[PDB]
Amino acid sequence: GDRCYNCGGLDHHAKECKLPPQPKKCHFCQSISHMVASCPLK
Amino acid sequence: PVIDESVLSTKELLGLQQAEERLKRDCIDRLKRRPRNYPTAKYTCRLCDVLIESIAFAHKHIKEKRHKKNIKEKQEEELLTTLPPPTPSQINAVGIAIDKVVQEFGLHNENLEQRLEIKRIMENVFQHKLPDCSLRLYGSSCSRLGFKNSDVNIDIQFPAIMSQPDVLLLVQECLKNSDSFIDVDADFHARVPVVVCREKQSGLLCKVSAGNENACLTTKHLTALGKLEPKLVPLVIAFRYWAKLCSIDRPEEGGLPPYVFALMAIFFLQQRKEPLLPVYLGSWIEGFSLSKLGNFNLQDIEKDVVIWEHTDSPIKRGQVSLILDVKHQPSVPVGQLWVELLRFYALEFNLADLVISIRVKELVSRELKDWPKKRIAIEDPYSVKRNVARTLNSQPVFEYILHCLRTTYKYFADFFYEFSKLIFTKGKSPTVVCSLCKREGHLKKDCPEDFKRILEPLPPLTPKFLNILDQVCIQCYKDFSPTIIEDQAREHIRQNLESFIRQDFPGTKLSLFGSSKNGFGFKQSDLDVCMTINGLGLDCVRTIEELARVLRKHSGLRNILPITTAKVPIVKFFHLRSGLEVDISLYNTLALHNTRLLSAYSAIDPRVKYLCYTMKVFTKMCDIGDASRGSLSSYAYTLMVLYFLQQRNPPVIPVLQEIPEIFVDGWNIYFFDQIDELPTYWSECGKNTESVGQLWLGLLRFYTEEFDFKEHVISIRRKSLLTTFKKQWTIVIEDPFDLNHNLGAGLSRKMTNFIMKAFINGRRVFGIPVYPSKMEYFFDPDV
RNA sequence: UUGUACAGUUUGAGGGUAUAUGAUACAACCCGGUACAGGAGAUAACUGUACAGG
Ligand SMILES: [Zn+2]
């Protein structure tokens, strides 16, 4: 339904995912620094 | 460094930084070092002070309820602390509310005059019986800090020769005689003895006591503070009303006493940023220290100055002004002082770890006062040892008062205010504490653990059942009666022990005493002996140790055990020739004399022998006979049965002591011992004709009901009734000779309840007409 | 017995069901084409906790 809070994966859910933490981001942003609510394309 | 981020890849260590930031926002941090028990520990939580192994474990911990509620409490505390000082209108409203409360429930000058009139009337009534005594008002009556409902406490001082119990009993007698006081009663077993009365015209409960030290001085100190500083009294009355609404002033339910808050009401003034009430002890006087503060103590007050004395453990006496001699005393309104008081007690002071004292500015550490850090502690100025806030000993009650303080501070930090129980408690209900059992849940008045409350009528006694009771009593006497050969063996054992002891300490003489020579000798009972030295500052401990060492040499004696913690140190061992326990004491002449008295009491009639033997077997069956277990010794039970026999419609046995004085060890040992002509000097001899079984059933009935242990002492010395108060004692039994030794002093409450239950069960089994054996039914542990 | 609070198992009640057009004999979920986020599972008995007892 949604990407894991850690690793940004899709195989497991937020609670299901338990692997070590990974950089926060979304595949749409494509970069760690950029944030969805403020992107160049918008 | 438990772990280093250099290992992680750039994206990896960046994500690890984000994870650490998130954990930090939840009050979870890293570990500088790890314990040997948990080498895998890598995190910790400050709120719970809890170690954590890994990041997954940390994320698991936050999900729990512990951290959630801790963070909620932290948020509430932050909200409380963020509030700024109150605005002038709000503080004026609070002051008006305090004024209204004091006017409605506070004391007035008319009340003080009326109480003075009560005291004068009591003085006039008491002149004919206690002309030299002088009465004064203390506590709430004289302090003005209490409520009009609060009782009238009157202390009567007497010449040093007179004794407190005697003066108080005489006061009760005069109160009973007079008609101005109705409902005269005595509560002599409270914290301080009191006589409670209710004057007819006044209707105000008055408690009369005497010799109340540390109370008159304390109330006069509070009165001086109130007179000199008018701002104190409104705060004290408001705080007392708050305590009453929160239901913590009464110490019966485990709360703090009512007047304690007064000591606290001044305290926050003392510890405030500007001390309104100056301290009375400190480094001002020469040779002062915190360790010496205990010796330092307030002595008296007069002419607006407190005089205090210091005695080294040279004497230093000095007077200090009660109030600061400063013209710039701040004009803080009462409401501001009240709000600052609430803030001080909530989120600005350590109630748990600091002692509330008004003598020294620097907060005395609980360790210096050798007090626990679990709960509140209030220091009374005129009694250093006492911790006046000890009535609260249950953590739930502490949490309740803390919640009351928190809610009232939040409420107190067209504005209108009011003192209400619901607002302060916020729906929480108190937690009554049983002061009698030290437990929680049941009030003293109704509680499962009340032996006195422990009844149904007995069935009628048929002649056959009475005959059966007499037969079983005689059977017990015969079964437990030592034979002649047993007496000869005991004499030989005593002689052998004396001879063996003489080897190391020549001249030693041994005399048998106790069950062996007191007329009531139990089969297989302990052999009690007393050792003396011919022609002889002797240390009981060293002598007992030497005797035990000597006995250890003997092959026959094994498991030698010297005991010195007891009042009379003794050597207890096992003799193979007797095959029984043997106890040896040193210079226990008083024991021999009391045993001889009991022997005479047995010799007068055989009914006494039968009764004592049946009592001993009944006690042994219930597992209360042995003294080492903490229960009353068999001597206490034989004393009880003798006392019962003496005090009965037909007097079975007379008081030998009552019917020249010889002082050995410091007490009189006289008692009529010529039984042969006893009837001549005794006018009631032969009046008793009840059967042994009937007499024993009467004994059980008398002790189960028709007797009081709290208000009477089981003493065989006096035919007349004796009262516990006159002995200043608070089951209690007095020796026939020594009046300062109580056999029930070491008896715990639980064992007393069990003993009363055993007596009730014995009364139930006996006296009920109706087992494989007749004897067994009357003596059965299960029933 | 006493004041307290959570480690595995079950039922009853919860958050979720937004981002889809066709299917699937009683033998078969499918190409999600747009919802926005710094957010990570609550209640009762099943004998395992860490503080106070006296
Ligand atoms: Zn994932």
PDB file of N, CA and C in Angstrom, chain B residues 246-286:
ATOM      1  N   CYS B 246      -9.036  17.688  50.280  1.00  0.00           N
ATOM      2  CA  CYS B 246      -8.373  16.529  49.696  1.00  0.00           C
ATOM      3  C   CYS B 246      -8.362  15.330  50.633  1.00  0.00           C
ATOM      4  N   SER B 247      -8.809  15.497  51.878  1.00  0.00           N
ATOM      5  CA  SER B 247      -8.939  14.399  52.833  1.00  0.00           C
ATOM      6  C   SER B 247      -7.584  13.745  53.109  1.00  0.00           C
ATOM      7  N   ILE B 248      -6.656  14.562  53.614  1.00  0.00           N
ATOM      8  CA  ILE B 248      -5.335  14.092  54.011  1.00  0.00           C
ATOM      9  C   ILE B 248      -4.932  14.573  55.395  1.00  0.00           C
ATOM     10  N   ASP B 249      -5.731  15.430  56.036  1.00  0.00           N
ATOM     11  CA  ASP B 249      -5.343  15.963  57.338  1.00  0.00           C
ATOM     12  C   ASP B 249      -5.477  14.912  58.434  1.00  0.00           C
ATOM     13  N   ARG B 250      -6.473  14.047  58.332  1.00  0.00           N
ATOM     14  CA  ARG B 250      -6.697  13.044  59.366  1.00  0.00           C
ATOM     15  C   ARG B 250      -5.619  11.970  59.286  1.00  0.00           C
ATOM     16  N   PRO B 251      -4.859  11.719  60.357  1.00  0.00           N
ATOM     17  CA  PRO B 251      -3.844  10.659  60.304  1.00  0.00           C
ATOM     18  C   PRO B 251      -4.409   9.260  60.469  1.00  0.00           C
ATOM     19  N   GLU B 252      -5.686   9.126  60.831  1.00  0.00           N
ATOM     20  CA  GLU B 252      -6.280   7.799  60.961  1.00  0.00           C
ATOM     21  C   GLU B 252      -6.276   7.067  59.627  1.00  0.00           C
ATOM     22  N   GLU B 253      -6.577   7.779  58.542  1.00  0.00           N
ATOM     23  CA  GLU B 253      -6.614   7.199  57.207  1.00  0.00           C
ATOM     24  C   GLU B 253      -5.257   7.241  56.511  1.00  0.00           C
ATOM     25  N   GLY B 254      -4.175   7.444  57.260  1.00  0.00           N
ATOM     26  CA  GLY B 254      -2.842   7.441  56.700  1.00  0.00           C
ATOM     27  C   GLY B 254      -2.333   8.785  56.227  1.00  0.00           C
ATOM     28  N   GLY B 255      -3.157   9.830  56.263  1.00  0.00           N
ATOM     29  CA  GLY B 255      -2.716  11.138  55.833  1.00  0.00           C
ATOM     30  C   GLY B 255      -1.811  11.811  56.850  1.00  0.00           C
ATOM     31  N   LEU B 256      -1.293  12.972  56.460  1.00  0.00           N
ATOM     32  CA  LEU B 256      -0.452  13.745  57.356  1.00  0.00           C
ATOM     33  C   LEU B 256      -1.308  14.428  58.423  1.00  0.00           C
ATOM     34  N   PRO B 257      -0.743  14.706  59.595  1.00  0.00           N
ATOM     35  CA  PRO B 257      -1.517  15.379  60.648  1.00  0.00           C
ATOM     36  C   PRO B 257      -1.981  16.749  60.189  1.00  0.00           C
ATOM     37  N   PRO B 258      -2.950  17.349  60.884  1.00  0.00           N
ATOM     38  CA  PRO B 258      -3.504  18.621  60.391  1.00  0.00           C
ATOM     39  C   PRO B 258      -2.567  19.803  60.563  1.00  0.00           C
ATOM     40  N   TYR B 259      -1.894  19.918  61.709  1.00  0.00           N
ATOM     41  CA  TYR B 259      -1.087  21.103  61.976  1.00  0.00           C
ATOM     42  C   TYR B 259       0.197  21.141  61.157  1.00  0.00           C
ATOM     43  N   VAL B 260       0.605  20.015  60.567  1.00  0.00           N
ATOM     44  CA  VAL B 260       1.891  19.966  59.876  1.00  0.00           C
ATOM     45  C   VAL B 260       1.944  21.026  58.789  1.00  0.00           C
ATOM     46  N   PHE B 261       0.825  21.234  58.095  1.00  0.00           N
ATOM     47  CA  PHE B 261       0.804  22.194  57.001  1.00  0.00           C
ATOM     48  C   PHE B 261       1.228  23.578  57.469  1.00  0.00           C
ATOM     49  N   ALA B 262       0.909  23.937  58.714  1.00  0.00           N
ATOM     50  CA  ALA B 262       1.372  25.215  59.243  1.00  0.00           C
ATOM     51  C   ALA B 262       2.891  25.302  59.184  1.00  0.00           C
ATOM     52  N   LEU B 263       3.579  24.271  59.679  1.00  0.00           N
ATOM     53  CA  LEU B 263       5.032  24.251  59.581  1.00  0.00           C
ATOM     54  C   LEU B 263       5.484  24.390  58.136  1.00  0.00           C
ATOM     55  N   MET B 264       4.709  23.849  57.195  1.00  0.00           N
ATOM     56  CA  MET B 264       5.040  23.999  55.785  1.00  0.00           C
ATOM     57  C   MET B 264       4.676  25.381  55.259  1.00  0.00           C
ATOM     58  N   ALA B 265       3.597  25.982  55.770  1.00  0.00           N
ATOM     59  CA  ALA B 265       3.178  27.288  55.266  1.00  0.00           C
ATOM     60  C   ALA B 265       4.250  28.340  55.513  1.00  0.00           C
ATOM     61  N   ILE B 266       4.903  28.287  56.674  1.00  0.00           N
ATOM     62  CA  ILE B 266       6.042  29.163  56.921  1.00  0.00           C
ATOM     63  C   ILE B 266       7.239  28.731  56.083  1.00  0.00           C
ATOM     64  N   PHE B 267       7.392  27.422  55.866  1.00  0.00           N
ATOM     65  CA  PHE B 267       8.622  26.903  55.276  1.00  0.00           C
ATOM     66  C   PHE B 267       8.884  27.514  53.905  1.00  0.00           C
ATOM     67  N   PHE B 268       7.864  27.556  53.043  1.00  0.00           N
ATOM     68  CA  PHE B 268       8.082  28.119  51.715  1.00  0.00           C
ATOM     69  C   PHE B 268       8.417  29.602  51.794  1.00  0.00           C
ATOM     70  N   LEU B 269       7.888  30.305  52.800  1.00  0.00           N
ATOM     71  CA  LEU B 269       8.305  31.685  53.026  1.00  0.00           C
ATOM     72  C   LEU B 269       9.786  31.748  53.367  1.00  0.00           C
ATOM     73  N   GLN B 270      10.264  30.797  54.170  1.00  0.00           N
ATOM     74  CA  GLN B 270      11.671  30.780  54.553  1.00  0.00           C
ATOM     75  C   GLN B 270      12.569  30.511  53.351  1.00  0.00           C
ATOM     76  N   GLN B 271      12.222  29.509  52.544  1.00  0.00           N
ATOM     77  CA  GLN B 271      13.054  29.091  51.422  1.00  0.00           C
ATOM     78  C   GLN B 271      12.823  29.915  50.164  1.00  0.00           C
ATOM     79  N   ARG B 272      11.886  30.860  50.184  1.00  0.00           N
ATOM     80  CA  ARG B 272      11.597  31.650  48.999  1.00  0.00           C
ATOM     81  C   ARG B 272      12.825  32.467  48.593  1.00  0.00           C
ATOM     82  N   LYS B 273      12.722  33.115  47.430  1.00  0.00           N
ATOM     83  CA  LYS B 273      13.825  33.941  46.950  1.00  0.00           C
ATOM     84  C   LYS B 273      14.155  35.041  47.949  1.00  0.00           C
ATOM     85  N   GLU B 274      13.132  35.682  48.506  1.00  0.00           N
ATOM     86  CA  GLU B 274      13.301  36.592  49.631  1.00  0.00           C
ATOM     87  C   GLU B 274      12.717  35.925  50.869  1.00  0.00           C
ATOM     88  N   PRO B 275      13.529  35.484  51.835  1.00  0.00           N
ATOM     89  CA  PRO B 275      12.954  34.836  53.021  1.00  0.00           C
ATOM     90  C   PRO B 275      12.156  35.802  53.883  1.00  0.00           C
ATOM     91  N   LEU B 276      10.831  35.632  53.903  1.00  0.00           N
ATOM     92  CA  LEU B 276       9.989  36.487  54.735  1.00  0.00           C
ATOM     93  C   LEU B 276      10.185  36.181  56.214  1.00  0.00           C
ATOM     94  N   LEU B 277      10.319  34.902  56.560  1.00  0.00           N
ATOM     95  CA  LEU B 277      10.533  34.487  57.935  1.00  0.00           C
ATOM     96  C   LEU B 277      11.993  34.102  58.116  1.00  0.00           C
ATOM     97  N   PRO B 278      12.792  34.865  58.860  1.00  0.00           N
ATOM     98  CA  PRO B 278      14.208  34.517  59.004  1.00  0.00           C
ATOM     99  C   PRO B 278      14.398  33.221  59.776  1.00  0.00           C
ATOM    100  N   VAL B 279      15.471  32.511  59.432  1.00  0.00           N
ATOM    101  CA  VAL B 279      15.812  31.261  60.102  1.00  0.00           C
ATOM    102  C   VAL B 279      16.245  31.575  61.525  1.00  0.00           C
ATOM    103  N   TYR B 280      16.339  30.543  62.359  1.00  0.00           N
ATOM    104  CA  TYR B 280      16.709  30.700  63.756  1.00  0.00           C
ATOM    105  C   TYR B 280      17.961  29.919  64.131  1.00  0.00           C
ATOM    106  N   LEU B 281      18.538  29.159  63.201  1.00  0.00           N
ATOM    107  CA  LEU B 281      19.807  28.480  63.418  1.00  0.00           C
ATOM    108  C   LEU B 281      20.654  28.588  62.158  1.00  0.00           C
ATOM    109  N   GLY B 282      21.965  28.623  62.353  1.00  0.00           N
ATOM    110  CA  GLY B 282      22.882  28.762  61.242  1.00  0.00           C
ATOM    111  C   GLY B 282      24.283  29.038  61.748  1.00  0.00           C
ATOM    112  N   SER B 283      25.153  29.409  60.809  1.00  0.00           N
ATOM    113  CA  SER B 283      26.551  29.672  61.131  1.00  0.00           C
ATOM    114  C   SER B 283      26.754  30.968  61.906  1.00  0.00           C
ATOM    115  N   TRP B 284      25.686  31.696  62.240  1.00  0.00           N
ATOM    116  CA  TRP B 284      25.846  32.942  62.983  1.00  0.00           C
ATOM    117  C   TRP B 284      26.500  32.694  64.336  1.00  0.00           C
ATOM    118  N   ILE B 285      26.072  31.652  65.037  1.00  0.00           N
ATOM    119  CA  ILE B 285      26.613  31.340  66.354  1.00  0.00           C
ATOM    120  C   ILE B 285      27.925  30.581  66.200  1.00  0.00           C
ATOM    121  N   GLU B 286      28.844  30.822  67.131  1.00  0.00           N
ATOM    122  CA  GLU B 286      30.142  30.162  67.098  1.00  0.00           C
ATOM    123  C   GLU B 286      29.996  28.666  67.357  1.00  0.00           C
TER     124      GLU B 286
END
